[PDB]
Paper text:
DOCK (dedicator of cytokinesis) proteins activate Rho family GTPases to regulate development, autoimmunity and bone homeostasis and they are involved in cancer and severe developmental and immune-related diseases. Here we focused on the DHR2 domain of human DOCK5 and analyzed the mechanisms of its inhibition by these chemical compounds. Finally, we used SAXS analysis of DOCK5DHR2 and crystallographic analysis of unbound Rac1-GDP to gain insight into structural features of the inhibitory mechanism of C21.
To investigate structural features in DOCK5 and Rac1 that could be susceptible to allosteric modulation by C21, we used synchrotron SAXS coupled to size exclusion chromatography (SEC-SAXS) to analyze the structure of DOCK5DHR2 and of the DOCK5DHR2-Rac1 complex in solution, and X-ray crystallography to determine the structure of Rac1-GDP. In contrast, residues 30GEY32 in the switch 1 of unbound Rac1-GDP are poorly ordered, which drives a unique conformation of the switch 1 that has not been seen in other Rac1 structures. When superposed to the Rac1/Dock2DHR2 complex, the switch 1 of Rac1-GDP lacks contacts with α6-β3 in the B lobe while residues 35TVF37 in the switch 1 conflict with the catalytic nucleotide sensor in the C lobe. We identified two such features: an unexpected conformational dynamics in DOCK5DHR2 that diminishes upon Rac1 binding, and a unique conformation of the switch 1 in unbound Rac1-GDP not seen in any of its other conformational states. In this model, the C lobe of DOCK5DHR2 features conformational dynamics that allows Rac1-GDP to bind in successive steps: first, Rac-GDP docks onto the C lobe by its structurally invariant switch 2 region; then, the dynamics of the C lobe brings the switch 1 in contact with the B lobe; finally, this interaction remodels the switch 1 to stabilize the complex, making way for the nucleotide sensor to reach into the nucleotide-binding site and promote the dissociation of GDP. This model suggests an allosteric mechanism in which C21 takes advantage of these dynamical features to stall DOCK5 in an abortive conformation where it can still bind the switch 2 of Rac1-GDP but cannot escort it to the B lobe.
Numbering used by the authors: 2 to 177
The structure:
Amino acid sequence: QAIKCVVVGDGAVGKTCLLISYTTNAFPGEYIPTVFDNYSANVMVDGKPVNLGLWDTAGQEDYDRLRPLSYPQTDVFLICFSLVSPASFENVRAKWYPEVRHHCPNTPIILVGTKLDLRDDKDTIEKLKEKKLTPITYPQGLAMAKEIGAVKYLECSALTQRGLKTVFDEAIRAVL
Ligand SMILES: Nc1nc2c(ncn2[C@@H]2O[C@H](COP(=O)(O)OP(=O)(O)O)[C@@H](O)[C@H]2O)c(=O)[nH]1
Ligand SMILES: [Mg+2]
């Protein structure tokens, strides 16, 4: 069974790094591909082989009209936000969940918090504190998930690859 998973969220949340890390088994560092592409993974999680088509999107305001053109035939969505970006977290309820439901009202959602490795980073915490902001905690993320009716809430880091295999395993689990 061939599954289709669309990845949505704000620019710089780490969507492309997440997809390259997972499929390639490596963090793309500084040079991240700039072409918005689709990826694939042949994975079997307690069954027979499954091909997971992974679709990256152009998250910026400029693509608001063209982005939903990749949504038709989608099996599951990954709404992404930076755990070290409250602006991207508010955009879950503000932008991403209304837009996903607009075009696909019955399609399952997995809420994904990225840059998990930066949540304990002293420099990142200091920068946020100056702007009177705090990183998103697991209870905050889980509440937003339940609010936006997400099937599951998951955290990960494409840098350390921690929680990454789970994200796409649960994407398959939200389908089937
Ligand atoms: N520390 C850390 N940096 C990351 C992670 N994922 C992406 N990045 C960085 O975050 C920025 C955004 O990456 P990118 O995939 O292009 O974001 P996109 O616009 O959502 O696709 C880049 O500077 C990446 O190097 C992560 O899990 N942890
Ligand atoms: Mg990208």
